[PDB]
Design a binder for this molecule. Structure first.
Ligand SMILES: [Mg+2]
Ligand SMILES: [Mg+2]
Ligand SMILES: [Mg+2]
Ligand SMILES: [Mg+2]
Ligand SMILES: [Mg+2]
Ligand SMILES: [Mg+2]
Ligand SMILES: [Mg+2]
Ligand SMILES: [Mg+2]
Ligand SMILES: [Mg+2]
Ligand SMILES: [Mg+2]
Ligand SMILES: [Mg+2]
Ligand SMILES: [Mg+2]
Ligand SMILES: [Mg+2]
Ligand SMILES: [Mg+2]
Ligand SMILES: [Mg+2]
Ligand SMILES: [Mg+2]
Ligand SMILES: [Mg+2]
Ligand SMILES: [Mg+2]
Ligand SMILES: [Mg+2]
Ligand SMILES: [Mg+2]
Ligand SMILES: [Mg+2]
Ligand SMILES: [Mg+2]
Ligand SMILES: [Mg+2]
Ligand SMILES: [Mg+2]
Ligand SMILES: [Mg+2]
Ligand SMILES: [Mg+2]
Ligand SMILES: [Mg+2]
Ligand SMILES: [Mg+2]
Ligand SMILES: [Mg+2]
Ligand SMILES: [Mg+2]
Ligand SMILES: [Mg+2]
Ligand SMILES: [Mg+2]
Ligand SMILES: [Mg+2]
Ligand SMILES: [Mg+2]
Ligand SMILES: [Mg+2]
Ligand SMILES: [Mg+2]
Ligand SMILES: [Mg+2]
Ligand SMILES: [Mg+2]
Ligand SMILES: [Mg+2]
Ligand SMILES: [Mg+2]
Ligand SMILES: [Mg+2]
Ligand SMILES: [Mg+2]
Ligand SMILES: [Mg+2]
Ligand SMILES: [Mg+2]
Ligand SMILES: [Mg+2]
Ligand SMILES: [Mg+2]
Ligand SMILES: [Mg+2]
Ligand SMILES: [Mg+2]
Ligand SMILES: [Mg+2]
Ligand SMILES: [Mg+2]
Ligand SMILES: [Mg+2]
Ligand SMILES: [Mg+2]
Ligand SMILES: [Mg+2]
Ligand SMILES: [Mg+2]
Ligand SMILES: [Mg+2]
Ligand SMILES: [Mg+2]
Ligand SMILES: [Mg+2]
Ligand SMILES: [Mg+2]
Ligand SMILES: [Mg+2]
Ligand SMILES: [Mg+2]
Ligand SMILES: [Mg+2]
Ligand SMILES: [Mg+2]
Ligand SMILES: [Mg+2]
Ligand SMILES: [Mg+2]
Ligand SMILES: [Mg+2]
Ligand SMILES: [Mg+2]
Ligand SMILES: [Mg+2]
Ligand SMILES: [Mg+2]
Ligand SMILES: [Mg+2]
Ligand SMILES: [Mg+2]
Ligand SMILES: [Mg+2]
Lengths: 100, 50, 78, 63
RNA sequence: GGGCGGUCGCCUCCUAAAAGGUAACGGAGGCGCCCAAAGGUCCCCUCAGGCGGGACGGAAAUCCGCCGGAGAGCGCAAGGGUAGAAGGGGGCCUGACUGCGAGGCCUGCAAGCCGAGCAGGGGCGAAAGCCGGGCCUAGUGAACCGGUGGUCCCGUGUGGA
RNA sequence: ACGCUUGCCCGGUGCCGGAAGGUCAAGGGGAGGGGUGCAAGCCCCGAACCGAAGCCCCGGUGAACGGCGGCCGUAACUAUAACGGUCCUAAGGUAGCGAAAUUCCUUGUCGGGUAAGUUCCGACCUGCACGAAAAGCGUAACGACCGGAGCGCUGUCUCGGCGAGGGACCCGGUGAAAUUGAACUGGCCGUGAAGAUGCGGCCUACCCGUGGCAGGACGAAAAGACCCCGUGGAGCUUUACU
RNA sequence: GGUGGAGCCUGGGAGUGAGGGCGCGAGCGAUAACGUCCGCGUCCGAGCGCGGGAACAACCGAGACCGCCAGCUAAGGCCCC
RNA sequence: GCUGGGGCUAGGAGUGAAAAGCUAACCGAGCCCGGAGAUAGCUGGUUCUCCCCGAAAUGACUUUAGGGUCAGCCUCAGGCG
RNA sequence: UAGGGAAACCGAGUCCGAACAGGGCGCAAGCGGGCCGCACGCGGCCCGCAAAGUCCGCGGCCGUGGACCCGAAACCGGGCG
RNA sequence: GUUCGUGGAGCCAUGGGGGAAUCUGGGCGGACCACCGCCUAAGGCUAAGUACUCCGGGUGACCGAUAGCGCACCAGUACCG
RNA sequence: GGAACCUGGGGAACUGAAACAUCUCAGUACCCAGAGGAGAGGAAAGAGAAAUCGACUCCCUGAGUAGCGGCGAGCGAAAG
């Protein structure tokens, strides 16, 4: 309440779509994770492990994405970025996507 | 206001507009104009009734 | 028997904003002027409302001398 | 009970990571005719000064 | 004091105390617009008046010569500035462009204004260079709900709407 | 109550009547389009046209709401209007009253009443701003209504006095009340929020009471009953909204 | 030059948005108001703590940490209270 | 006409020879309970001690001027020096 | 712990845009620092519980709840007269 | 009614008007069309887990006759209406 | 008839939006009906995207999220 006048919040417009009366479209999302950060531990890294290691809240799917050096090991994910393919490509073999 | 007839100039082939008036009182009827679009690179432009 | 005229305009607040002997950057307004009381010299550009600004950075100087108007000279540093 | 997010604020402004509040500029939506390419074009997410300490208070639980 | 009357926004000058700001039911006035040219570039010319005359002509129509440095004009009230053009005349055009915009004036915030320069593609000029409207300050209205075109971004299981 | 009357205009509004005509809802009808599907099919729109009440339009209605003017010239100076020309005009107040429960100027003017009358009575009309059923003018009787005058008589007064009873005063008995910062509480002149017992200067005043006056303590009662504010709350009105 | 309850940046926390007096520069008023409204500064508010002006917030001096039967001074006075 | 006894009429309602009178000593919409600890930007009050610093009554806006949001003035903590 | 963008989508980059022009968001900038691993690019180390955040306590403030307290004129529901 | 206030407005019940079919029949997956998935409405019943304390008892950084329930006492009593 | 609770049928106003009529307060207080030691609901013409779960009730989450709203005040799930 900025006095009886129009507040600064009300004077500036709005941009995004509010949505329809059913709500939002429940689509899955992606979670970028740094390849200088999950390169600590070792093994054929998958879900059910990285969601237990402290990161990766038990929800939507992930993708490996960071600015740093990596370790040569296997990794199974759903997506990869157009630089982490090359930073991970150094002695690294991976499937680019799961069962879908 | 009510003499200016504020309008917008159309692409004259596809899509865009240019938002400048043309008077109804003075006989400035059907004024051709070259202006800069985005895609078509300085083609001609004409009026619209809006 | 009422008040005939008691309104007044809000001031546009013109004036000299950068005096001489001041280090400036490229883009500083040297003077906000109503009419062109100051004429452009070296590295000085005018705008729409006769406002002149600096083109380069350096120590500015006024009054090269008269007979045509007051001068503003943005002089570069070497 | 638990406080409610101001939906007008959530639909109008967007708070960034380092505390800054990003919102659009005004004087653009209704009438845009007698304006230059500068005055049409320069609607470029102005910043708010000394009000975000009273503007991130209603962007509160989800930020 | 309230009521009656006047005013509620913007611009100009003074009050306003030689930076900026600054009040009163203080004084004097304007505005809710207009120009395809009254815009950009290039190229020519300098005004209003007074004197000596004229064929009508008010002492003002139109013409010549001298004096006249800005007392004219610059669309519009007032202020600033202007003939070493911004004023008057002619040719060609629409930059009365699109994406940005360094750095600033001012402001509590919201707003308002100047903007060198980069890219694309132009206009004028042989070029140097100018052009992101009008000599400038007033000519307007935040937000919300919707209308008309384009964008094909989302579109609620899937494909479309 | 009653005697004499209710004269002017239907333009605005209310009302009544209107098988001509304009507008308009739900609805009927539907050319022509849109989505989807291989199509068969399904779902959305949809302009023409028809379609009451109501509104608009015409007439009537004033013992329906409502109103009823100014201006220039003319008769032995004045005055006229009874006459001649205009209309924001629908229409310009007729009869009967009138400085009146109406009149601001005004205590208008004249006459009565008084020696003296801003009141009263009867006229004059110069009605800011009477008026015909929000009725107009009178009216025999009547009114704890109002205004004026006169008569015999009265302290009401000039101008007060005396007497009687119940209180007041004293004593015996019971014995509250609102108010209340503490007070050991003088006057004048100045100052102080601009009206001093308390502040400064001067003067007066032994302490404590009893009866009385109410000038002060801006004395008491009620958080001003007048005025203003509150985006306070209610009652009422309307062609303010729904 | 200036080490000061000076400044600059961030964050938390209030209060204030009825002001008034005085000198000057002003407007309105009547070159009237202990009148209204600004600016430049001070004071009161918040220093009704002190001395003087008889008494009195803004006229002058002075910025009260406390105590002492110590001095010197500011404004103002030296006939007596 | 006055009055006794038995009744009926009621709260946006009743009744009223019409004042907005009366309806259980107060009626321009009663009384009791509940919503309801309604609201009040409008008055008043707000309780132990000591120490340090210390305001403002200004500017920009508001169906708004006696109240507000931001800035100005103040304090605390952490940094610059 | 990665954020941009309205979303799609992309990601140490995103968006505005034809664009590596340009700009807005974040990014890495080094605190305790035996790190000399012996190449002065030192990669990164004993190592301050921190850049980096979470859980609990204790305080200031705030929102919803009556929210420092007292006090209305009134409104509605159910009834009593 | 569901968050759904008429918005693109589904579904669940319906006040009114029109109005069938019985698995090759229907409803739903948010205007709607096709595909693909879920379920049988227009009949009824159902313990257990959940709310509350007239009453019984144990506990309390709960109180100690102006506290605590209105009443520790012969209290919803005396008293008012 | 029963201190409180529950279901169904009606159902407000002050307040909040610093007025205020849609909205909030709130389907709350209040009125009526029946039953209970609980009531209601209940064996999918369900949910909603996974070819998945599998009656119903309650707590914590999801989450003040999606959404609704003079898009103001504010109200507010459901799936799992
Ligand atoms: Mg969150
Ligand atoms: Mg000045
Ligand atoms: Mg000055
Ligand atoms: Mg020009
Ligand atoms: Mg030139
Ligand atoms: Mg700004
Ligand atoms: Mg011009
Ligand atoms: Mg669907
Ligand atoms: Mg679909
Ligand atoms: Mg097919
Ligand atoms: Mg077909
Ligand atoms: Mg078909
Ligand atoms: Mg009688
Ligand atoms: Mg006597
Ligand atoms: Mg007796
Ligand atoms: Mg006695
Ligand atoms: Mg005195
Ligand atoms: Mg004394
Ligand atoms: Mg004395
Ligand atoms: Mg007496
Ligand atoms: Mg200080
Ligand atoms: Mg104020
Ligand atoms: Mg003030
Ligand atoms: Mg002042
Ligand atoms: Mg004063
Ligand atoms: Mg004075
Ligand atoms: Mg002081
Ligand atoms: Mg005193
Ligand atoms: Mg003294
Ligand atoms: Mg003093
Ligand atoms: Mg001291
Ligand atoms: Mg001495
Ligand atoms: Mg009786
Ligand atoms: Mg009632
Ligand atoms: Mg009634
Ligand atoms: Mg009646
Ligand atoms: Mg009574
Ligand atoms: Mg009453
Ligand atoms: Mg109360
Ligand atoms: Mg309530
Ligand atoms: Mg307030
Ligand atoms: Mg101090
Ligand atoms: Mg502040
Ligand atoms: Mg510090
Ligand atoms: Mg970038
Ligand atoms: Mg950058
Ligand atoms: Mg870091
Ligand atoms: Mg806390
Ligand atoms: Mg609905
Ligand atoms: Mg149904
Ligand atoms: Mg039905
Ligand atoms: Mg169906
Ligand atoms: Mg369906
Ligand atoms: Mg069944
Ligand atoms: Mg018990
Ligand atoms: Mg007790
Ligand atoms: Mg005791
Ligand atoms: Mg009794
Ligand atoms: Mg209940
Ligand atoms: Mg119900
Ligand atoms: Mg209400
Ligand atoms: Mg309210
Ligand atoms: Mg609700
Ligand atoms: Mg029973
Ligand atoms: Mg029962
Ligand atoms: Mg049980
Ligand atoms: Mg049960
Ligand atoms: Mg049951
Ligand atoms: Mg059952
Ligand atoms: Mg079954
Ligand atoms: Mg669940």
């Amino acid at each position: 309440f900025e006095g009886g006048r129009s507040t600064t919040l009300m004077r500036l417009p709005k941009r995004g779509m509010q949505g329809q009366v059913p709500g939002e479209i429940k689509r899955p999302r992606y979670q970028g994770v740094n390849l200088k950060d999950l390169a600590r531990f070792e093994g054929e890294v998958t879900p059910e492990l990285l969601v237990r290691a402290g990161l990766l809240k038990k929800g939507y799917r992930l993708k490996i994405l960071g600015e740093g050096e990596a370790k040569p090991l296997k990794v199974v994910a759903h997506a990869f970025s157009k630089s982490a393919l090359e930073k991970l490509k150094a002695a690294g073999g991976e499937p680019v996507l799961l069962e879908a | 206001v009510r003499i200016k007839l504020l309008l917008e100039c159309t692409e004259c082939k596809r899509r865009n507009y240019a938002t400048e008036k043309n008077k109804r009182n003075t006989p400035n009827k059907l004024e051709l104009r070259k202006y800069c679009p985005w895609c078509r690179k300085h083609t001609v432009h004409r009026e619209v009734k809006i | 028997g009422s008040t005939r005229n008691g309104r007044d305009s809000q001031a546009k607040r013109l004036g000299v904003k950068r005096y001489e002997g001041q280090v400036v950057r490229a883009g500083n307004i040297l003077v906000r002027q109503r009419g062109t009381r100051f004429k452009p010299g070296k590295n000085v550009g005018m705008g729409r409302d006769f406002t002149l600004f600096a083109l380069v950075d350096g120590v500015v100087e006024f009054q090269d001398r008269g007979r045509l108007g007051r001068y503003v000279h943005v002089r570069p540093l070497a | 009970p638990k406080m409610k997010t101001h939906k007008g604020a959530k639909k109008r402004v967007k708070i960034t990571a380092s505390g800054k509040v990003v919102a659009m500029k005004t004087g653009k939506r209704h009438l845009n005719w007698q304006k230059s390419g500068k005055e049409i074009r320069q609607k470029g997410r102005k910043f708010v000064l000394a009000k975000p300490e009273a503007e991130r208070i209603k962007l509160l639980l989800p930020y």
